[PDB]
């Protein structure tokens, strides 16, 4: 049983939450209903405090949470594990990655971006420099999905720290936990608690309040698309950044070896596997040129059966389960469907409520439920695609998104192809879509975002004013 | 009478928007009243066309207008002053400006931004490398208001060009004719058509499709804030730049000598008269510490009292009309209004029309229509604020707006204390709050923008989206 924390307060209501863990559905824990109010509360406290830390102060902050996350890492990844259903193997990683975030935020504190400008330039010239630096919002607004329920709200979180911004947080309300422990923990670090608050409840009550709040300079979202539509359509003068899904590709050219095919077979399973497939760079697509798909697919067969699949909570366990069990039956509809309609189901030893095994299906229609919709699922999903790349490029163009991808080719001028051709936010060469650096510029473009790019780096910038000033010189 | 530009084709409509002179409200051409069929075929022609231009050949074309502009300052500045009614001495200004937009965005085309990462830096890095490259839009939706009918083109379509987008620009259909002859211009220094088109008519035939078609990846608007606010609205899902108005404050510090008193007063004068007072950055409030004011006004009305106001057309005028009868006359009522507030009026001339002369008033009250609100004309307004620099900054910043500022001092500790306390985006220390030069960021917070900078180097940016590619290194 867990209550909001306000500002270093705890708040709590008469209704609650409850938090179900996936494996068993059994009551992990429960957290308030919070409404309106508490979120207006939150907002308040953000915008009456000014945040005066010096850069020193902010990076030994964050370095003291990152090496709080990796002391406490047994802790976190088992309140992971609890609500979200992923292996402790899963979780383990993602408190890693929660430790990057916080890391580099706090080393790129150090870093001063200040540009200067000479006047004297053009016939309308002056003696004159013009110098830049940056301010903080008022507040800022974070919605999270149940994704990552540590690493996604790190990156909406450190970020906000490290530039002296003060930020409200509403994580879902699915896996809302991890959230309440990491602002505990960031107040242990020496966060002044105006800095943050988490809140919790029915997106029907206080998730309006999260977008409208007339103190929220900007609102930053990962989700679902419709749920983005609804924060655009109500957020309208602020600034946002809207991270919405993929449905990302790893591509299989026909130059390969047998020795690579390999290679490239433990990225297919890994990346349509990791966190249960629930990334929204996870592998949904694999577009396998058809000259090597004989030789492709059994590998990934060999590879997908080596993975121990069952108990999250059991450290032998690679893959844990879905975030519940309507969407793993969901998804095992949709490997059905696709096998009504072609496809060649290899290896599906049987859902058992949320746990859904790492199904393989060969020949899988690109036009089917199965890639088509969001399957947020460890499903390892085939496509056979042409021997001819402008194909293959206009094929994997051919979703509502463009997020991210991987490709694996040995030719360059095939690579510089694809990097050029593929409308996504990034592409990368034998590696997972879902690979980056916790600073590397990450979004993507139609629906998979608004346009703006975060990281942590690009985060820092999106949370500051640019200020200008002259000086004659 | 000159017909739309779509995509170099001359496009006529039976219907017709007459363009008046504000001078002598006589009729001075005529533009298609288009629809919304037009703003659709040009950017179906937008989305369509891929630009192939090198940055080379793109430079070309951009020196090519510069050129062109410089060898037509004289036509263009006609054409500016024959629909706005500003003065040559201001129109010719502007054309000077477009100048710098075309030259320096040019000279941009070299610079290539992109960034290398390592990715070895964590427990979670690899041995690889990230890259970062830019990437044009599908189609670039531009809408201008009147107070610079080129240089607000050239700010939204110099960027464009440079980074290889298609836009459209819908210019107010008060001074439309500046923005066809702009695009004429571009056509002839070599600009493929379908990278261009100026489209005409009533807002409520035409600008609905600026905002909400489905190829536009971004809306630049530049124009009044219930508008901006609107599009904001209407303009849902899009990514928007919006750049408002502004209230801007010159403030004197009393420090001052007497000697720089007289320098202050002339930059009051010119910051609050300049283009007719008609820029979102012109000096609206003059905030003169009270220990000083006694000395300070009467050097600016000496200063107001030279200028020459009347027909634009004439060589000898400084100060032209503003857009329209109704504009100067709601202007003049705000002063009349102010004194009967306890405002001293200390030269008002008379109105003739849309025709203002440089009025000033003293001991304006912050709170009259006249200083709280923007009053888009060449009002001289002196507010009278305590010899408290912390009282002061409050003062400034207690308007809706936040865009520039200019603060004359010699005291460095105070000039840093304001540069670090108004809540705008730009302080000129010893300049008016207009000045800047065309390529650093540009932009306000609060009511005077959505929070995007712009300015030749940051539309160029926000002109793209950023791609990022990964190899194995
Ligand atoms: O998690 P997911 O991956 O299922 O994606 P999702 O889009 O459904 O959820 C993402 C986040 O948005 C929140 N949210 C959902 N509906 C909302 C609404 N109407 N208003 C405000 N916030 C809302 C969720 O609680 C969650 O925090
Ligand atoms: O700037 P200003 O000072 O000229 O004032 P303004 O805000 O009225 O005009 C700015 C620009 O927006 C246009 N505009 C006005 N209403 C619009 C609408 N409903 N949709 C799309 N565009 C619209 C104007 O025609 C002009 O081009």
Same mark, same amino acid.
């Given at each position: 049983?867990?209550?909001?924390?306000?500002?270093?307060?705890?708040?709590?209501?008469?209704?609650?939450?409850?938090?179900? %863990?996936?494996?068993?559905?059994?009551?992990?824990?429960?957290?308030?209903?919070?409404?309106?109010?508490?979120?207006?509360?939150?907002?308040?406290?953000?915008?009456?405090?000014?945040?005066?830390?010096?850069?020193?102060?902010?990076?030994?902050?964050?370095?003291?949470?990152? #090496?709080? /996350?990796?002391?406490?890492?047994?802790?976190? +990844?088992?309140?992971?594990?609890?609500? /979200?259903?992923?292996?402790?193997?899963? +979780?383990?990683?993602?408190?890693?990655?929660?430790?990057?975030?916080?890391?580099?935020?706090?080393?790129?504190?150090?870093?001063?971006?200040?540009?200067?400008?000479?006047?004297?330039?053009?016939?309308?010239?002056? $003696?004159?420099?013009?110098?830049?630096?940056?301010?903080?919002?008022?507040?800022?607004?974070? =919605?999270?999905?149940?994704?990552?329920?540590?690493?996604?709200?790190?990156?909406?979180?450190?970020? $906000?720290?490290?530039?002296?911004?003060?930020?409200?947080?509403?994580?879902?309300?699915?896996?809302?936990?991890?959230?309440?422990?990491?602002?505990?923990?960031?107040? #242990?670090?020496?966060?002044?608690?105006?800095?943050?608050?988490?809140?919790?409840?029915?997106?029907?009550?206080?998730?309006?309040?999260?977008?409208?709040?007339?103190?929220?300079?900007?609102?930053?979202?990962?989700?679902?698309?419709?749920?983005?539509?609804?924060?655009?359509?109500?957020?309208?003068?602020?600034?946002?950044?809207?991270?919405?899904?993929?449905?990302?590709?790893?591509?299989?050219?026909?130059?390969?070896?047998?020795?690579?095919?390999?290679?490239? $077979?433990?990225?297919?399973?890994?990346?349509?596997?990791?966190?249960?497939?629930?990334?929204?760079?996870?592998?949904?697509?694999?577009?396998?040129?058809?000259?090597?798909?004989?030789?492709?697919?059994?590998?990934?067969?060999?590879?997908?059966?080596?993975?121990?699949?069952?108990?999250?909570?059991?450290?032998?366990?690679?893959?844990?389960?879905?975030?519940?069990?309507?969407?793993?039956?969901?998804?095992?509809?949709?490997?059905?469907?696709?096998?009504?309609?072609?496809?060649?189901?290899?290896?599906?030893?049987?859902?058992?409520?949320?746990?859904?095994?790492?199904?393989?299906?060969?020949?899988?229609?690109?036009?089917?439920?199965?890639?088509?919709?969001?399957?947020?699922?460890?499903?390892?999903?085939?496509?056979?695609?042409?021997?001819?790349?402008?194909?293959?490029?206009?094929? +994997?163009?051919?979703?509502?998104?463009?997020?991210?991808?991987?490709?694996?080719?040995?030719?360059?001028?095939?690579?510089?192809?694809?990097?050029?051709?593929?409308?996504?936010?990034?592409?990368?060469?034998?590696?997972?879509?879902? %690979?980056?650096?916790?600073?590397?510029?990450?979004?993507? =473009?139609?629906?998979?975002?608004?346009?703006?790019?975060?990281?942590?780096?690009?985060?820092?910038? +999106?949370?500051?004013?640019?200020?200008?000033?002259?000086?004659?010189?």
């Amino acid at each position: 049983h867990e209550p909001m924390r306000i500002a270093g307060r705890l708040v709590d209501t008469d209704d609650r939450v409850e938090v179900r %863990y996936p494996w068993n559905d059994t009551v992990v824990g429960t957290v308030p209903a919070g409404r309106a109010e508490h979120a207006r509360e939150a907002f308040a406290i953000a915008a009456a405090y000014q945040p005066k830390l010096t850069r020193y102060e902010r990076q030994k902050i964050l370095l003291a949470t990152a #090496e709080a /996350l990796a002391a406490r890492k047994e802790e976190i +990844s088992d309140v992971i594990t609890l609500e /979200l259903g992923i292996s402790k193997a899963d +979780s383990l990683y993602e408190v890693g990655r929660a430790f990057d975030v916080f890391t580099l935020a706090g080393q790129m504190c150090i870093r001063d971006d200040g540009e200067i400008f000479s006047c004297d330039l053009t016939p309308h010239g002056k $003696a004159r420099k013009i110098f830049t630096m940056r301010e903080p919002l008022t507040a800022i607004s974070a =919605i999270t999905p149940f994704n990552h329920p540590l690493n996604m709200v790190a990156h909406k979180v450190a970020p $906000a720290i490290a530039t002296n911004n003060c930020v409200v947080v509403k994580p879902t309300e699915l896996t809302p936990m991890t959230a309440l422990l990491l602002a505990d923990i960031l107040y #242990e670090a020496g966060l002044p608690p105006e800095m943050l608050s988490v809140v919790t409840g029915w997106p029907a009550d206080i998730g309006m309040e999260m977008i409208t709040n007339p103190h929220v300079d900007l609102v930053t979202f990962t989700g679902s698309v419709p749920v983005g539509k609804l924060i655009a359509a109500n957020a309208h003068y602020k600034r946002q950044v809207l991270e919405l899904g993929g449905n990302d590709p790893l591509i299989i050219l026909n130059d390969l070896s047998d020795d690579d095919l390999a290679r490239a $077979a433990d990225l297919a399973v890994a990346g349509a596997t990791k966190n249960s497939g629930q990334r929204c760079t996870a592998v949904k697509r694999i577009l396998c040129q058809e000259s090597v798909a004989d030789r492709f697919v059994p590998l990934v067969l060999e590879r997908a059966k080596r993975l121990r699949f069952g108990d999250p909570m059991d450290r032998s366990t690679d893959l844990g389960t879905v975030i519940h069990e309507k969407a793993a039956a969901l998804f095992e509809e949709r490997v059905m469907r696709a096998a009504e309609e072609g496809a060649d189901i290899l290896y599906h030893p049987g859902r058992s409520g949320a746990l859904l095994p790492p199904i393989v299906v060969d020949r899988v229609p690109h036009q089917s439920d199965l890639v088509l919709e969001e399957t947020f699922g460890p499903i390892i999903p085939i496509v056979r695609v042409p021997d001819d790349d402008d194909a293959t490029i206009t094929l +994997s163009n051919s979703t509502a998104f463009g997020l991210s991808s991987g490709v694996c080719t040995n030719d360059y001028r095939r690579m510089q192809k694809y990097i050029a051709g593929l409308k996504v936010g990034t592409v990368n060469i034998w590696e997972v879509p879902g %690979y980056r650096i916790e600073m590397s510029p990450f979004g993507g =473009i139609k629906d998979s975002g608004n346009g703006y790019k975060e990281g942590v780096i690009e985060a820092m910038k +999106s949370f500051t004013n640019v200020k200008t000033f002259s000086l004659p010189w």
